Design a protein around this ligand. Structure first.
Ligand SMILES: *[C@@H]1O[C@H](CO)[C@@H](O[C@@H]2O[C@H](CO)[C@@H](O)[C@H](O)[C@H]2NC(C)=O)[C@H](O)[C@H]1NC(C)=O
Ligand SMILES: *[C@@H]1O[C@H](CO)[C@@H](O[C@@H]2O[C@H](CO)[C@@H](O)[C@H](O)[C@H]2NC(C)=O)[C@H](O)[C@H]1NC(C)=O
Ligand SMILES: *[C@@H]1O[C@H](CO)[C@@H](O[C@@H]2O[C@H](CO)[C@@H](O)[C@H](O)[C@H]2NC(C)=O)[C@H](O)[C@H]1NC(C)=O
Ligand SMILES: *[C@@H]1O[C@H](CO)[C@@H](O[C@@H]2O[C@H](CO)[C@@H](O)[C@H](O)[C@H]2NC(C)=O)[C@H](O)[C@H]1NC(C)=O
Ligand SMILES: *[C@@H]1O[C@H](CO)[C@@H](O[C@@H]2O[C@H](CO)[C@@H](O)[C@H](O)[C@H]2NC(C)=O)[C@H](O)[C@H]1NC(C)=O
Ligand SMILES: *[C@@H]1O[C@H](CO)[C@@H](O[C@@H]2O[C@H](CO)[C@@H](O)[C@H](O)[C@H]2NC(C)=O)[C@H](O)[C@H]1NC(C)=O
Ligand SMILES: *[C@@H]1O[C@H](CO)[C@@H](O)[C@H](O)[C@H]1NC(C)=O
Lengths: 169, 193, 50, 86, 50
């Protein structure tokens, strides 16, 4: 309002406390932006890692798993996403960096590839990936032999459909 | 013998009412902050010009208070709608939505009243003390593939059992807990038993 | 010349046009100037605050 | 100590990672240890490799009953102001 | 005479700053609901089968 001039600054005192309210409001909305991120991404206790030898029954997760030779250890599809999108004014940095959030999503993704839904209810219990896929088929009302007799076709369809997200983005 | 999410509402509302009260002692560019000391030592033509600045400042104070109450009541309404939905889905039923009624497999919930809110006590089931086993998708017997009806095939190292998936309780593999579909030459990982 | 402000002046890598006397950016704040004796253009940076 | 949030004076920069205590920003937190004020990069949690293979399964042999609380604001104070008397 | 002219600027700039701060409250209340939906989808679609 004044820009470092004592004449304007003394007249401003006559307006009371409007400018302590404005700062209180902006601080209250800058704290909840970090609260917003904490409740979407910190949904794990452990940071789970995936095994070095990756045989998941024909399913291929290589375009969504972290890539060490990339920036911030992001996945291949997390990169396409980060490439597509003075006077009393300042911008505060977020509490979680982008590296930390990519770490959180890789822990969620290694928990689900490897334990199914067990890690969101307690300790993670490993199960082979095709048997997890058979449980999920049971959950929609198809029998398990329909997965086990069509494993290679279901895995090819999944791989070919993950390959199209990458093109469309 | 915790409740900060309820103390935050009390504190924010008191902190707004205090600011509204305290803005009644600014001049807003008049000679006095009290209206009677403008009325007592001034006559109508010049009392009016000083009274108008007080009216202008106090109106703006009041409008800021009311707008920020309207924005905060809309946040309280979302919370109360969520608490109504939890009362219906967690206390009057058993939910399958993950994490909706506590961490773990929801069993039941009990409500308790609080000063301007509600406390839900969620009872959940949490599995414990896991052991390692060897698995197979199907069994092969007589040139037929056998699948479990509800469970998994597990091996303790030498013997094969069926168990339910959340509690270890091994049983013999019979024609009453399995079903048949096909040959044992199409599924990847059949074992012979 | 009448351009009045406060800040820290450094030397720059801009190139005005011979008739242009000072620069400004988006939001229309002055961020460069030409001084009327050296004929050199100088960057203007606000003095640290926080 | 120079962070990305600014310049920090009066806190020692340790090398270990704890849970966040007071958020400084851009990944840095501070805490009162032992007796002094220290500043560190926060930790996300303990690491864990799952013994995944293609014929191994983990099955639980016991359980616990857990009870936890959840608190929700329902209402606030009803206030009125007479605009004229204010 | 400069008091009367400075007050006209003070009033305008205060109005503009307070309009900025109201519209940010209204925009943050909308980002908050989106993040609340994202947190529910992470629980119900990523750590479960819906
Ligand atoms: C999973 O799919 C990826 C494709 O995205 C495979 O990796 C690429 O395969 C092509 C074809 O041989 C090579 O030219 C590339 O060099 C591979 N690496 C890339 C693109 O980073 C990968 O081999 C597949 N995984 C398995 C186990 O087959
Ligand atoms: C199931 O077996 C695996 C593999 O044998 C066990 O994984 C061990 O994990 C520890 C981590 O503290 C490693 O140091 C070992 O090298 C792993 N292999 C071993 C001990 O053979 C896993 O702990 C077992 N699970 C249960 C519930 O006993
Ligand atoms: C796997 O389980 C089987 C059956 O529970 C075990 O076989 C039995 O072991 C008991 C040990 O006291 C013997 O008395 C029985 O005669 C065995 N055969 C049966 C019940 O048919 C087997 O020992 C277990 N294997 C391992 C490695 O623990
Ligand atoms: C599961 O993985 C194991 C080990 O990675 C596989 O065992 C390998 O099987 C191939 C052919 O069946 C052999 O050539 C390898 O020598 C085996 N590895 C070892 C260490 O013995 C197994 O085939 C996989 N599939 C299952 C169990 O269905
Ligand atoms: C499981 O048992 C079957 C027999 O019931 C085995 O099948 C034989 O496999 C050999 C080698 O592949 C063939 O030469 C025979 O003709 C098969 N006989 C029959 C009746 O199918 C099978 O190899 C066994 N597999 C394991 C892992 O034990
Ligand atoms: C303004 O006048 C000064 C001299 O009063 C000029 O300064 C000279 O500038 C040249 C560069 O073109 C130097 O080589 C000389 O050494 C300078 N002399 C002195 C005494 O400073 C300056 O160029 C003049 N500028 C304009 C725009 O008229
Ligand atoms: C912290 O660890 C790094 C290791 O790269 C080391 O260079 C640095 O001196 C350490 N600082 C302290 C205070 O121990």
């Amino acid at each position: 309002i004044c820009g470092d001039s004592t004449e304007c600054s003394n007249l401003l005192l006559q307006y009371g406390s409007f400018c302590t309210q404005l700062n209180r409001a902006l601080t209250g909305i800058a704290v909840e932006q970090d609260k917003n991120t904490q409740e979407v991404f910190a949904q794990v206790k452990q940071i789970y890692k995936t095994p070095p030898i990756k045989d998941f029954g024909g399913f291929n997760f290589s375009q969504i798993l972290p890539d060490p030779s990339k920036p911030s250890k992001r996945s291949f599809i997390e990169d396409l996403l980060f490439n597509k999108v003075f006077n009393g004014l300042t911008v505060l940095p977020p509490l979680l960096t982008d590296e930390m959030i990519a770490q959180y999503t890789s822990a969620l993704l290694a928990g689900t590839i490897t334990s199914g839904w067990t890690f969101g209810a307690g300790a993670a219990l490993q199960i082979p990936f095709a048997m997890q896929m058979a449980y999920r088929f049971n959950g929609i009302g198809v029998t398990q032999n329909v997965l086990y007799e069509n494993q290679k076709l279901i895995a090819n369809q999944f791989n070919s459909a993950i390959g199209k997200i990458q093109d469309s983005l | 013998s915790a409740l900060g999410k309820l103390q935050d509402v009390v504190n924010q509302n008191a902190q707004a009412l205090n600011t509204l009260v305290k803005q009644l002692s600014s001049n807003f560019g008049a000679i006095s902050s009290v209206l009677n000391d403008i009325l007592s030592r001034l006559d109508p033509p010049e009392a009016e010009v000083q009274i108008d600045r007080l009216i202008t400042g106090r109106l703006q104070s009041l409008q800021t208070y009311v707008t920020q109450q309207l924005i905060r009541a809309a946040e309280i309404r979302a919370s109360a709608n969520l608490a109504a939905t939890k009362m219906s889905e967690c206390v009057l039923g058993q939910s399958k939505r993950v994490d909706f009624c506590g961490k773990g497999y929801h069993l039941m919930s009990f409500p308790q009243s609080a000063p301007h809110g509600v406390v839900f006590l969620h009872v959940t089931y949490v599995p414990a003390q896991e052991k390692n086993f060897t698995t197979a998708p199907a069994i092969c017997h007589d040139g037929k593939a056998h699948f479990p009806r509800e469970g998994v095939f597990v091996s303790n190292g030498t013997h094969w059992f069926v168990t339910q998936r959340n509690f270890y309780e091994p049983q013999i593999i019979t024609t009453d807990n399995t079903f048949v579909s096909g040959n044992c030459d199409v599924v990847i990982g059949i074992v012979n038993n | 010349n009448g351009l009045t402000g406060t800040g820290v002046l450094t030397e720059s890598n801009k190139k005005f046009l011979p008739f242009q006397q000072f620069g400004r950016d988006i939001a229309d704040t002055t961020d460069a100037v030409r001084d009327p004796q050296t004929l050199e253009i100088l960057d203007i940076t606000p003095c640290s605050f926080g | 100590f120079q962070t990305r949030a600014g310049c920090l004076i009066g806190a020692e920069h340790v090398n270990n990672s704890y849970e966040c205590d007071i958020p400084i920003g851009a990944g840095i937190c501070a805490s009162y240890q032992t007796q002094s004020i220290i500043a560190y990069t926060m930790s996300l949690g303990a690491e864990n490799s799952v013994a995944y293979s293609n014929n191994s399964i983990a099955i639980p042999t016991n359980f616990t009953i857990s009870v936890t609380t959840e608190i929700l604001p329902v209402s606030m104070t009803k206030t009125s102001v007479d605009c004229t008397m204010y």
